[PDB]
A paper describes a structure:
To understand how TatD binds and cleaves DNA, we further co-crystallized TatD with a single-stranded DNA (5′-GCTTAGCT-3′). TatD–DNA complex was crystallized by the hanging-drop vapor diffusion method and the co-crystal diffracted X-ray to a resolution of 2.9 Å. The simulated annealing omit Fourier map (2Fo − Fc) of the bound DNA revealed weak electron density for the three nucleotides (5′-G-p-C-p-T-3′). The 8-nucleotide single-stranded DNA was likely digested by TatD and resulted a 3-nucleotide DNA. Alternatively, it is possible that the 5′ end of the DNA was disordered and only the three nucleotides at the 3′ end were observed. The DNA was refined with an occupancy of 0.7 and an averaged B-factor of 69.2 Å2 and was bound at the loop region on the top of the TIM-barrel in a way similar to that of Endo IV. Superimposition of the apo-form and DNA-bound TatD gave an average RMSD of 0.394 Å for 259 Cα atoms, suggesting that DNA binding did not induce any major conformational change. However, a close look at the protein–DNA interface showed that the loop with R98 and F100 moved toward DNA in the TatD–DNA complex structure, and as a result, the two residues, R98 and F100 were disordered and refined with an occupancy of 0.79 and 0.85, respectively. Moreover, the residue H64 near the scissile phosphate had two alternative conformations and was refined with an occupancy of 0.53 (apo-form conformation) and 0.47 (flip-out conformation), respectively. However, no metal ion was identified in the TatD–DNA complex structure and DNA is bound loosely between two TatD molecules in the crystal, indicating that the 5′-G-p-C-p-T-3′ was bound in an inactive conformation.
Residue numbers in the entry: 1 to 260
Write the structure that this text describes.
């Protein structure tokens, strides 16, 4: 199994980042994709990717930080992407559920990073919340020039899922599906996701699975909870956890071009 959603730069892991990484590996996790959310966090993720074996990173600007985008920013992401630890351009995309950055500059910073991925021939680590239609319009002229793409932390509908998959977009599934409150719609579309478009992640330190027993006092998510998520996903697909692990790991290698 592989975790494509680890925000390891987070200050929540500051006290025990080594132990966090080590424990995940001791649970069956075969690799980590350390998420970069802005220029500064992308540079830190590249440093952590050298620090640990079987760890890579993404370089990009989150739609939440899309207001930070300048002309000096592009080349800065490229100096970082040149590293053999950086395998994806992201996290980038649209987030209209919030207002942290104006949708004008969200869109601008999204297309800019999409152009970068086309220039360097790299896959993208995408983010989309309540912005599906505007998402596919901006992706439309760029996607055919990219190796691949992933809609990580997908929370949309099954129609939206089939809309993305039709264009070769990998669907990322977190422990959001483990929430009884607001994970009903997701769990029912899970068997419809083509197994070779499925990717598993934790989005640590967020989206700690609610069906965990017992619950950690801290309630901080970590990549050591990935096997739990795969098992639930496999069960809700009527699959063997070992089989889906071998498939989801192939998808990681196919999309990112890494080995573990």
């Amino acid at each position: 199994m592989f975790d494509i959603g680890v925000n390891l730069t987070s200050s929540q892991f500051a006290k025990d980042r080594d132990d966090v990484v080590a424990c995940a590996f001791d649970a069956g996790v075969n690799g980590l994709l350390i998420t970069g959310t802005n220029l500064r966090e992308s540079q830190q993720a590249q440093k952590l990717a050298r620090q640990y074996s079987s760890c890579w990173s993404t370089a990009g600007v989150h739609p939440h930080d899309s207001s930070q985008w300048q002309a000096a920013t592009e080349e800065a992401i490229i100096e970082l992407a040149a590293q053999p630890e950086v395998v994806a351009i992201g996290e980038c995309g649209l987030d209209f559920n919030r207002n942290f950055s104006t949708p004008e500059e969200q869109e601008r910073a999204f297309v800019a990073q999409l152009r970068i991925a086309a220039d360097l021939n790299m896959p993208v680590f995408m983010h989309c919340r309540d912005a599906h239609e505007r998402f596919m319009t901006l992706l439309e002229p760029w996607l055919d020039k990219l190796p691949g793409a992933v809609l990580h932390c997908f929370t949309g509908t099954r129609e939206e899922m089939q809309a993305c998959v039709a264009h070769g977009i990998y669907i990322g599934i977190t422990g959001w599906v483990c929430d009884e409150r607001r994970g009903l719609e997701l769990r029912e579309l899970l068997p419809l996701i083509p197994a070779e478009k499925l990717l598993i992640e934790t989005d640590a330190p967020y989206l700690l699975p609610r069906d965990l027993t017992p619950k950690p006092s801290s309630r901080r998510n970590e990549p050591a909870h990935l096997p739990h998520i795969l098992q639930r996903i496999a069960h809700w697909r009527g699959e063997d956890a070992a089989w889906l692990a071998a498939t989801t790991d192939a998808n990681v290698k196919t999309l990112f071009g890494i080995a573990f």
